[PDB]
Motif scaffolding. Structure first.
Motif, PDB file in Angstrom:
ATOM      1  N   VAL B  33       0.841  -1.192   0.000  1.00 59.62           N
ATOM      2  CA  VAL B  33       0.000   0.000   0.000  1.00 59.62           C
ATOM      3  C   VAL B  33       0.878   1.244   0.000  1.00 59.62           C
ATOM      4  CG1 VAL B  33      -1.891  -1.194   1.150  1.00 59.62           C
ATOM      5  CG2 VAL B  33      -0.170   0.016   2.507  1.00 59.62           C
ATOM      6  N   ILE B  34       0.254   2.410  -0.150  1.00 57.87           N
ATOM      7  CA  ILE B  34       0.944   3.695  -0.125  1.00 57.87           C
ATOM      8  C   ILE B  34       0.331   4.529   0.990  1.00 57.87           C
ATOM      9  CG2 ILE B  34       1.461   5.812  -1.374  1.00 57.87           C
ATOM     10  CD1 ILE B  34       1.264   4.118  -3.970  1.00 57.87           C
ATOM     11  N   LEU B  35       1.166   4.983   1.917  1.00 57.16           N
ATOM     12  CA  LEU B  35       0.706   5.728   3.079  1.00 57.16           C
ATOM     13  C   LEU B  35       1.041   7.207   2.938  1.00 57.16           C
ATOM     14  CD1 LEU B  35       1.840   3.270   5.913  1.00 57.16           C
ATOM     15  CD2 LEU B  35      -0.302   3.298   4.614  1.00 57.16           C
ATOM     16  N   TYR B  36       0.113   8.050   3.385  1.00 55.26           N
ATOM     17  CA  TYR B  36       0.343   9.486   3.450  1.00 55.26           C
ATOM     18  C   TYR B  36      -0.652  10.093   4.426  1.00 55.26           C
ATOM     19  CZ  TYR B  36      -3.629   9.776   0.211  1.00 55.26           C
ATOM     20  OH  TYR B  36      -4.863   9.658  -0.385  1.00 55.26           O
ATOM     21  N   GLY B  37      -0.227  11.166   5.087  1.00 61.31           N
ATOM     22  CA  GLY B  37      -1.044  11.824   6.077  1.00 61.31           C
ATOM     23  C   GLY B  37      -0.662  13.276   6.271  1.00 61.31           C
ATOM     24  N   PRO B  38      -1.661  14.143   6.414  1.00 56.26           N
ATOM     25  CA  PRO B  38      -1.391  15.563   6.685  1.00 56.26           C
ATOM     26  C   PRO B  38      -0.539  15.761   7.931  1.00 56.26           C
ATOM     27  CG  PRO B  38      -3.670  15.275   6.029  1.00 56.26           C
ATOM     28  CD  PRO B  38      -3.089  13.890   6.150  1.00 56.26           C
ATOM     29  N   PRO B  39      -0.762  15.008   9.022  1.00 55.26           N
ATOM     30  CA  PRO B  39       0.195  15.111  10.141  1.00 55.26           C
ATOM     31  C   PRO B  39       1.580  14.598   9.784  1.00 55.26           C
ATOM     32  CG  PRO B  39      -1.899  14.261  10.906  1.00 55.26           C
ATOM     33  CD  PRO B  39      -1.934  14.204   9.416  1.00 55.26           C
ATOM     34  N   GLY B  40       1.665  13.417   9.178  1.00 59.44           N
ATOM     35  CA  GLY B  40       2.958  12.864   8.806  1.00 59.44           C
ATOM     36  C   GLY B  40       3.841  12.633  10.017  1.00 59.44           C
ATOM     37  N   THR B  41       5.099  13.060   9.904  1.00 59.20           N
ATOM     38  CA  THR B  41       6.114  12.980  10.952  1.00 59.20           C
ATOM     39  C   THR B  41       6.443  11.542  11.346  1.00 59.20           C
ATOM     40  OG1 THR B  41       4.977  14.953  11.778  1.00 59.20           O
ATOM     41  CG2 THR B  41       6.927  14.249  12.976  1.00 59.20           C
ATOM     42  N   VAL B 129       5.955  -3.780  -0.668  1.00 58.27           N
ATOM     43  CA  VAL B 129       6.623  -2.495  -0.481  1.00 58.27           C
ATOM     44  C   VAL B 129       5.576  -1.499   0.002  1.00 58.27           C
ATOM     45  CG1 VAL B 129       7.892  -0.616  -1.561  1.00 58.27           C
ATOM     46  CG2 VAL B 129       8.388  -2.992  -2.183  1.00 58.27           C
ATOM     47  N   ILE B 130       5.631  -1.153   1.284  1.00 57.61           N
ATOM     48  CA  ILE B 130       4.768  -0.125   1.855  1.00 57.61           C
ATOM     49  C   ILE B 130       5.505   1.205   1.795  1.00 57.61           C
ATOM     50  CG2 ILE B 130       3.694   0.723   3.966  1.00 57.61           C
ATOM     51  CD1 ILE B 130       3.122  -2.191   4.709  1.00 57.61           C
ATOM     52  N   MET B 131       4.897   2.190   1.142  1.00 58.11           N
ATOM     53  CA  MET B 131       5.483   3.513   0.982  1.00 58.11           C
ATOM     54  C   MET B 131       4.779   4.504   1.898  1.00 58.11           C
ATOM     55  SD  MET B 131       5.943   3.619  -3.167  1.00 58.11           S
ATOM     56  CE  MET B 131       6.758   5.213  -3.218  1.00 58.11           C
ATOM     57  N   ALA B 132       5.545   5.450   2.437  1.00 60.45           N
ATOM     58  CA  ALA B 132       5.003   6.450   3.347  1.00 60.45           C
ATOM     59  C   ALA B 132       5.691   7.782   3.088  1.00 60.45           C
ATOM     60  CB  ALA B 132       5.188   6.029   4.808  1.00 60.45           C
ATOM     61  N   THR B 133       4.893   8.815   2.821  1.00 68.53           N
ATOM     62  CA  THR B 133       5.406  10.147   2.537  1.00 68.53           C
ATOM     63  C   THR B 133       4.529  11.173   3.245  1.00 68.53           C
ATOM     64  OG1 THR B 133       6.113  11.665   0.783  1.00 68.53           O
ATOM     65  CG2 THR B 133       4.052  10.461   0.447  1.00 68.53           C
ATOM     66  N   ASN B 134       4.908  12.445   3.117  1.00 67.85           N
ATOM     67  CA  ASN B 134       4.156  13.531   3.735  1.00 67.85           C
ATOM     68  C   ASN B 134       3.088  14.097   2.808  1.00 67.85           C
ATOM     69  OD1 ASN B 134       5.504  13.620   6.294  1.00 67.85           O
ATOM     70  ND2 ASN B 134       7.250  14.617   5.296  1.00 67.85           N
ATOM     71  N   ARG B 135       3.440  14.378   1.556  1.00 68.66           N
ATOM     72  CA  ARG B 135       2.511  14.923   0.575  1.00 68.66           C
ATOM     73  C   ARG B 135       2.442  13.985  -0.621  1.00 68.66           C
ATOM     74  NH1 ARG B 135       0.367  19.965   0.254  1.00 68.66           N
ATOM     75  NH2 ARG B 135       1.894  20.742   1.779  1.00 68.66           N
ATOM     76  N   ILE B 136       1.219  13.625  -1.022  1.00 63.73           N
ATOM     77  CA  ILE B 136       1.022  12.691  -2.127  1.00 63.73           C
ATOM     78  C   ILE B 136       0.902  13.389  -3.475  1.00 63.73           C
ATOM     79  CG2 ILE B 136      -1.495  12.579  -2.236  1.00 63.73           C
ATOM     80  CD1 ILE B 136       0.955   9.580  -2.170  1.00 63.73           C
ATOM     81  N   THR B 138       2.977  15.750  -4.736  1.00 61.23           N
ATOM     82  CA  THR B 138       4.277  16.008  -5.343  1.00 61.23           C
ATOM     83  C   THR B 138       4.864  14.787  -6.041  1.00 61.23           C
ATOM     84  OG1 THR B 138       5.382  15.545  -3.237  1.00 61.23           O
ATOM     85  CG2 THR B 138       4.795  17.835  -3.707  1.00 61.23           C
ATOM     86  N   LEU B 139       4.306  13.601  -5.818  1.00 59.85           N
ATOM     87  CA  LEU B 139       4.809  12.395  -6.459  1.00 59.85           C
ATOM     88  C   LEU B 139       4.325  12.316  -7.900  1.00 59.85           C
ATOM     89  CD1 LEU B 139       4.389   9.755  -3.601  1.00 59.85           C
ATOM     90  CD2 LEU B 139       6.491  10.868  -4.384  1.00 59.85           C
ATOM     91  N   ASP B 140       5.179  11.785  -8.771  1.00 63.30           N
ATOM     92  CA  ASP B 140       4.835  11.676 -10.177  1.00 63.30           C
ATOM     93  C   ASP B 140       3.749  10.619 -10.380  1.00 63.30           C
ATOM     94  OD1 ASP B 140       6.696  13.614 -10.916  1.00 63.30           O
ATOM     95  OD2 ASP B 140       8.299  12.135 -11.162  1.00 63.30           O
ATOM     96  N   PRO B 141       2.880  10.804 -11.376  1.00 59.48           N
ATOM     97  CA  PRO B 141       1.771   9.865 -11.586  1.00 59.48           C
ATOM     98  C   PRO B 141       2.184   8.508 -12.134  1.00 59.48           C
ATOM     99  CG  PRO B 141       1.301  12.042 -12.522  1.00 59.48           C
ATOM    100  CD  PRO B 141       2.764  11.993 -12.235  1.00 59.48           C
ATOM    101  N   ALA B 142       3.481   8.244 -12.296  1.00 56.91           N
ATOM    102  CA  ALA B 142       3.920   6.955 -12.818  1.00 56.91           C
ATOM    103  C   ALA B 142       3.797   5.833 -11.798  1.00 56.91           C
ATOM    104  CB  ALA B 142       5.367   7.050 -13.307  1.00 56.91           C
ATOM    105  N   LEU B 143       3.787   6.154 -10.504  1.00 52.45           N
ATOM    106  CA  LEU B 143       3.635   5.141  -9.467  1.00 52.45           C
ATOM    107  C   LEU B 143       2.179   4.837  -9.138  1.00 52.45           C
ATOM    108  CD1 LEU B 143       6.473   6.197  -6.984  1.00 52.45           C
ATOM    109  CD2 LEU B 143       6.456   4.229  -8.531  1.00 52.45           C
ATOM    110  N   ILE B 144       1.227   5.506  -9.785  1.00 50.33           N
ATOM    111  CA  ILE B 144      -0.179   5.390  -9.412  1.00 50.33           C
ATOM    112  C   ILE B 144      -0.842   4.238 -10.156  1.00 50.33           C
ATOM    113  CG2 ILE B 144      -2.421   6.530  -9.441  1.00 50.33           C
ATOM    114  CD1 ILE B 144      -0.914   9.196  -9.103  1.00 50.33           C
ATOM    115  N   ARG B 145      -0.881   4.317 -11.485  1.00 50.69           N
ATOM    116  CA  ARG B 145      -1.629   3.332 -12.259  1.00 50.69           C
ATOM    117  C   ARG B 145      -0.880   2.007 -12.395  1.00 50.69           C
ATOM    118  NH1 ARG B 145      -5.745   5.297 -15.471  1.00 50.69           N
ATOM    119  NH2 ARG B 145      -6.136   3.063 -15.815  1.00 50.69           N
ATOM    120  N   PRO B 146       0.409   1.993 -12.764  1.00 46.87           N
ATOM    121  CA  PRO B 146       1.109   0.700 -12.824  1.00 46.87           C
ATOM    122  C   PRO B 146       1.411   0.111 -11.458  1.00 46.87           C
ATOM    123  CG  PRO B 146       2.136   2.331 -14.267  1.00 46.87           C
ATOM    124  CD  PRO B 146       1.244   3.069 -13.326  1.00 46.87           C
TER     125      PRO B 146
END
Lengths: 686, 232
Positions: B33-41, B129-136, B138-146
């Motif tokens: 899965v891909i993780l992101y949250g406004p709090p983040g940290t 592969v679990i991904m975690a970032t602060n803002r979703i 800014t990531l390029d759209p290449a990791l979304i559909r494939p």
């Protein structure tokens, strides 16, 4: 309060001032004093002064015990004869009598070698039976039989604290650090307190370490008294050695009073529950018969397909897959494939005769000899297959019945201090055939007959095979596999001087020094004897590169329990085999991430004997993580030995001597395929 | 966030754990899965990454600092992650605080290298592969559909409620006085994430360490509030 009124009381020497001041120090002795007892420099002059002098001895041992001393502290207590659940009692008894009586028991235990320390030891034993904090008074009173009356004196109510705690940490620390002669007292007094108590399998582990014949009778009248049953017969047969199940079957063949341990205990019943339930509860597919049975070719992976057949298991399709599969096979592969039907039929005694009967007395010598080998593999209590093989035996030059002596002496050794099979083995070693596996399965077979003996023996059996061993100095492989059976006959010792007797009468040029170091290996199965570990470090640098292999290979037998120190720098060496020595030292353990981490470096090698040697322990140590290192081997190669051994490892994946012999005999795989005919018949695989 | 943590728990804890309804079902989403949250940290993201540490292998690589600290070697370390993630697969690949894009054109080709190489080009999927970032965004759209085909989760904006709950989790290990109320804290703050309340916890325990005391009176809680309230 301040020391102004009470401090100058020690200056006068009047008797009443002592006989009332000392009780005041007993009232204030709940915390010793206001401080760290800084009166020593003023009251030390009172040593020479002599009514109530034992109270002055109590104050003197109180302050000398309070600040510092190692020998002068318990003298006022051994001269005092203590007399006259509390904080004061925990202070002067618990810690002061714990450390005080501990250093008295150590100083007098190491100094002289009286009854005063025995009476003080029993008094502290009772007082700490009142304190009820285990394993610490116990772990202190281990060194000072005394421990016998200590345990039978202490074991009244608590069963699982003394049994589980004391027997767990003191059994593990007793086999780790404590020398052997105290473990016998552990086993006998544990036989007493566990004889009084329930949960008999702990006393069955006492039979595992004792190897006694009365324990199994008491535990069979006691397990008979408490009616699971077949399950404890199963791990009973797993726990018992070769001696006590035949003595067990002779005394229980004598009486046993119920015929049901004669039914269970001697054959058919550590197999009867498993195989039908194994076919029921397990469901293995066919794409490994077809796939794993499809990547085999070139008449060597075909031998890996005899490994498929014998060591594949529910489904028995590859067993009955048409014919000509053994006709395409080779001769020693005809031995391995004729024994493969012996491996597929460790059950179905009645079906074994009607399945192997086709391959019996056939046109091909290896079909009938490997067929009798199958008859020896399939069971261990039938003993009705002997006569057709035993009658044919005599050949005196080369004839088939010497290969029927391979499969029938070896298979009968798997079936088996007999006194007819070794008298039949006298013309076997007296024959001295050129085939290595004749004396191979002779020494290994008589050793498996002799493993677990009462402190070994130096009888004319192995003395005869030593003299006839040194008779002909040819084919040093005899000097490699004969000390195998020699050390197997050495097994079962507790105090045997057979290492010194062999140090006298088996020592020569390096054609019997491998026998000397083999007796050194099997004579040191394992205890707390680190003198042989620094001896291991000293002789490890010997110029001879085989006593390094076996003598350094003993590490997995010696420290097999404390496996935290077993990872060493053997892989970092630069000799010829040392990496192989640690590679074997992995073995078949559960194989945590550190072991596979060692298989990361051991997996990648260039020599065919080490790349061939790595998948054996790699797949024994792991019986979505099994087939991945196999694909790693496919990335390594894509010779024939590595491919046969890596498929053989796929089939491998999918102190009992029965699991210790087969591979210590297997440490000589770096030879012709004739040995690989005996590689397939290893009984260590469960 | 009970459903949000039991959906990642049931999502990534289906392979290799409770396997009777994973391999017999014929689904196998080996992408994580891909993780992101406004709090983040990494507080809630590490409180959800710790939910998988029970029976599994953990692998934490925070940020792309170890890549952008030297010459532009490129995706070779990602290929090492493919050979260690191929030869050893229990480990869930957890990457937190993804600030690679924030040269850039080489991040596009190691992004195409982890995208292409992560799908299991040589096997039936190999590693989660679990991904975690602060803002979703800014990531390029290449990791979304494939890449993402299973699920990605969004963290809602509480405004009050999970500010109170995140205060409760930040102050669960610490000691809060009776007079220290919560309404004035979750109310006086105006759009403050988990890092700011972790900072007022940092001045609570740190300013308590300044006086070498373990207790924090209300007056010392506002005087302690002045520490990061002045530092921020």
């Amino acid at each position: 309060r301040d020391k102004a009124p009470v401090q100058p009381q020690q200056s006068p020497a009047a008797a009443p001032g002592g006989t009332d001041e000392k009780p005041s120090g007993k009232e204030r002795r709940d915390a010793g004093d206001k401080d760290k007892e800084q009166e020593l420099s003023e009251e030390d002059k009172q040593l020479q002064d002599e009514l109530y002098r034992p109270a002055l001895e109590e104050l003197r041992r109180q302050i000398r015990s309070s600040t510092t001393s190692m020998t002068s502290v318990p003298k006022p207590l051994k001269f005092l004869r203590p007399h006259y659940n509390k904080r004061f009692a925990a202070d002067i008894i618990s810690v002061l009598a714990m450390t005080m009586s501990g250093e008295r028991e150590c100083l007098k235990y190491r100094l002289v070698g009286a009854g005063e320390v025995a009476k003080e030891w029993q008094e502290l034993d009772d007082a700490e039976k009142v304190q009820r904090e285990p394993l610490l008074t116990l772990v202190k009173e281990i060194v000072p039989l005394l421990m016998e009356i200590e345990q039978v004196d202490m074991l009244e109510k608590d069963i699982d604290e003394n049994a589980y705690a004391k027997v767990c940490l003191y059994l593990t620390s007793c086999v780790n650090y404590v020398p052997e002669p105290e473990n016998s007292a552990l086993l006998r007094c544990a036989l007493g307190v566990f004889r009084k108590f329930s949960r008999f399998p702990e006393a069955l582990r006492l039979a595992l370490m004792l190897n006694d014949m009365e324990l199994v009778e008491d535990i069979f009248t006691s397990c008979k008294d408490v009616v699971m049953l077949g399950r404890h017969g199963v791990f009973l047969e797993l726990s018992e050695d070769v001696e006590e199940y035949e003595d067990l079957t002779e005394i229980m063949s004598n009486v046993q009073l119920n015929s049901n341990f004669l039914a269970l205990a001697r054959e058919l019943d550590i197999m009867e529950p498993k195989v039908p339930d194994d076919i029921y509860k397990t469901h293995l597919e066919n794409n490994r018969f077809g796939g794993s049975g499809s990547q085999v070719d070139s008449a060597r992976m075909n031998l890996a397909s005899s490994f498929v057949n014998g060591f594949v298991n529910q489904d028995k399709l590859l067993t009955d897959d048409g014919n000509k599969w053994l006709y395409k096979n080779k001769d020693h592969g005809m031995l391995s494939a004729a024994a493969s039907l012996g491996m597929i039929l460790l059950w179905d005694v009645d079906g074994g005769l009607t399945q192997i009967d086709k391959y019996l007395y056939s046109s091909e010598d290896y079909i009938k000899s490997g067929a009798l080998l199958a008859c020896g593999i399939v069971n261990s209590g039938v003993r009705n297959e002997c006569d057709p093989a035993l009658a044919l035996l005599s050949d005196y030059v080369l004839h088939n019945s010497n290969t029927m002596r391979l499969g029938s002496i070896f298979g009968l050794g798997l079936a088996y201090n007999r006194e007819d099979v070794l008298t039949l083995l006298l013309p076997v070693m007296g024959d001295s055939k050129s085939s290595m596996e004749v004396a191979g399965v002779t020494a290994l077979a008589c050793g498996m007959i002799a493993v677990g003996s009462c402190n070994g023996d130096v009888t004319s059996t192995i003395l005869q095979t030593i003299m006839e061993k040194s008779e002909t100095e040819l084919k040093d492989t005899y000097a490699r596999w004969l000390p195998l059976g020699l050390g197997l006959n050495h097994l079962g010792k507790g105090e045997a001087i057979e290492a010194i007797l062999a140090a006298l009468e088996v020592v020569s040029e390096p054609f019997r020094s491998f026998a000397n170091t083999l007796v050194d290996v099997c004579a040191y199965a394992g205890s707390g004897n680190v003198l042989k570990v620094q001896q291991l470090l000293h002789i490890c640098s010997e110029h001879f590169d085989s006593k390094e292999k076996e003598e350094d290979k003993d590490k997995k037998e010696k420290k097999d329990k404390d496996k935290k120190e077993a990872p060493a720098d053997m892989g970092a060496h630069q000799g010829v085999a040392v990496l192989g020595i640690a590679l074997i030292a992995m073995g078949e353990e559960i194989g945590a991430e550190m072991a596979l981490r060692t298989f990361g470096h051991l997996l990648r090698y260039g020599e065919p004997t080490l790349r061939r040697a790595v998948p054996l322990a790699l797949a024994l140590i792991s019986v979505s993580h099994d087939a991945d290192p196999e694909v790693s081997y496919n990335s390594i190669f894509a010779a024939r030995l590595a491919a046969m051994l890596r498929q053989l490892a796929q089939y491998h994946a999918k102190k009992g001597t029965l699991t210790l012999c087969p591979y210590h005999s297997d440490r000589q795989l770096m030879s012709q395929v004739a040995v690989a005919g005996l590689l397939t018949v290893l009984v260590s695989f469960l | 966030l009970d459903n949000q943590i039991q959906e990642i728990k049931e999502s990534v804890e289906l392979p290799l754990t409770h396997p009777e309804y994973y391999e017999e079902m014929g689904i196998k989403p080996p992408k994580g899965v891909i993780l992101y949250g406004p709090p983040g940290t990494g507080k809630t993201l590490l409180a959800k990454a710790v939910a998988n540490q029970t029976s599994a292998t953990f692998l934490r690589v925070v940020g792309s600092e170890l890549i952008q600290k030297y010459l532009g070697d490129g995706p070779k370390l990602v290929r090492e992650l493919f050979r260690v993630a191929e030869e050893h697969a229990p480990s869930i690949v957890f990457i937190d605080e993804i600030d690679a894009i924030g040269g850039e054109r080489e991040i596009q080709r190691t992004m195409l290298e982890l995208l292409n190489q992560l799908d299991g080009f040589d096997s039936r999927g190999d590693v989660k592969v679990i991904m975690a970032t602060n803002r979703i965004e800014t990531l390029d759209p290449a990791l979304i559909r494939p890449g993402r085909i299973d699920r990605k989760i969004e963290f809602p904006l509480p405004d009050e409620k999970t500010k109170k709950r995140i205060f409760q989790i930040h102050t669960s290990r610490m000691t809060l006085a009776d007079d220290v109320t919560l309404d004035d804290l979750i109310m006086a703050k105006d759009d403050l994430s988990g890092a700011d309340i972790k900072a007022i916890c940092t001045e609570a325990g740190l300013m308590a360490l300044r006086e070498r005391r373990m207790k924090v009176t209300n007056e010392d809680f506002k005087k302690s509030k002045e520490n990061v309230l002045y530092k921020k």
